[PDB]
Amino acid sequence: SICPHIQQVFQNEKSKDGVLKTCNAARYILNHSVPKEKFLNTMKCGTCHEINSGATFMCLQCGFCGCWNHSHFLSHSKQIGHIFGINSNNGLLFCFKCEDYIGNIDLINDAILAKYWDDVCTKTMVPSMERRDGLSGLINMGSTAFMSSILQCLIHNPYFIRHSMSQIHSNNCKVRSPDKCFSCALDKIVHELYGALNSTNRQTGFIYLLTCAWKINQNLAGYSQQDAHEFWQFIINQIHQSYVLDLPNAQCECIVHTVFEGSLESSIVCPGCQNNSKTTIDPFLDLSLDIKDKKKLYECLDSFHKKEQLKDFNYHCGECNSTQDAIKQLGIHKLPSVLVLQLKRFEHLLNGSNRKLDDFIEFPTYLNMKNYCSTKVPDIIYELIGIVSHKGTVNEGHYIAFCKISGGQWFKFNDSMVSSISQEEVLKEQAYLLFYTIRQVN
């Protein structure tokens, strides 16, 4: 089941070290080449001179690059016997004798560890089958759906997973323990869902979290029904506070403040002379959008970004001296890596009650933020990765989470039930919170 050509090369330690060195070199070049150089020098066939004639492969043995579409690397490997090439779009190693990629050798996939590999193999193992995607249910402990729904979006967030598995918190944590430390409790959940702590399995970390949460805020600890947005904001604030607590020497550099933080530009404009000061800059960790009388998410972003003339604001223009009602606009000044949206699914009525807004709002699988940034603006596309939905009324209900992982697959998280679900069915849910991750900036 492994390419025998590469295994044959790997019999000799030096030859093996040579392959890994060239693979490391090719991949370093692919991540550190400006776009023009990358096209001209990694995607241009040495024989037909076309750019992107299908995949272009960089030879392991000489400096030649050859294309897929005209069989030009295949010719190189028959003419000269250089049978291994690296695909310049993704760094993957192809065997031209097998006519297949070599994707199932851990050392090649993890080549940046080549020099440590002896120690890596013996002390660490590959994930176990059922744990490899961290999919696991969190039992309802009373009214914990507002917790678990958010927890599932967090442990499927690629930025939070990388952070946790990189041991950044663990390495620096002063308080040391999942009983007292809220961050350590989060890390124990990841430990349990993707690793081994070594029916009601895999609930230990979630119990630890319930305990930490009780010590800080009993209302958000799972006894009574609460808001999922409020719990979301509670968790990230605890992550940030842990980081401040752990610094030797107390714009923030913690994981929350480098991933979820953007800023809004609020401008107040003279309708007299178009004077554009003073503009105010407010940070945000999420955007809360009004939805009344709307049917699409873009229409809700339009509303948030729409000019308002302020009728209760006392304005005096410093340029023209006008006292007309000023024009107010919110624009996005800085975008975050992960855009979190809360739909304001609730209204207050002048008869002294509140009611949920149950309207379906259409949300797209990829979101362009270009038309919402203040101040040409390029395409800025985020991919939808998580949805928290609420069923019930304003005062009582239940939360479910939907999250997206590699390979296009969505899962539905409803307390202890984790289920497979099609993208099509996810797009029909009543979204309360939406989690979008940056994909493309032109």
Partner: protein, 76 residues
């Protein structure tokens, strides 16, 4: 000092305040304009809800800052 609240419909309202005003006082001004009882209001600035027993200056809210008003969608 004048600050703004973006309310449940996205309509912005203006409040006259001082940095030493308590959050509970701010909520009572919003109640006067919107009719929403203070204990049902969540006021968000910079990713934090503003807590009763603290002041606008505790959160560095300055002139022409915008607060975002939400309610709670309870669930469990």
């Amino acid at each position: 000092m004048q600050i703004f609240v973006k309310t449940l419909t996205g309509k912005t309202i203006t409040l006259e305040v001082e940095p030493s005003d308590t959050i509970e006082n701010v909520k009572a001004k919003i109640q006067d304009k919107e009719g929403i009882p203070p204990d049902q209001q969540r006021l968000i600035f910079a990713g934090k809800q503003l807590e009763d027993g603290r002041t606008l200056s505790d959160y560095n809210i300055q002139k022409e800052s915008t607060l975002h008003l939400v309610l709670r969608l309870r669930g469990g």
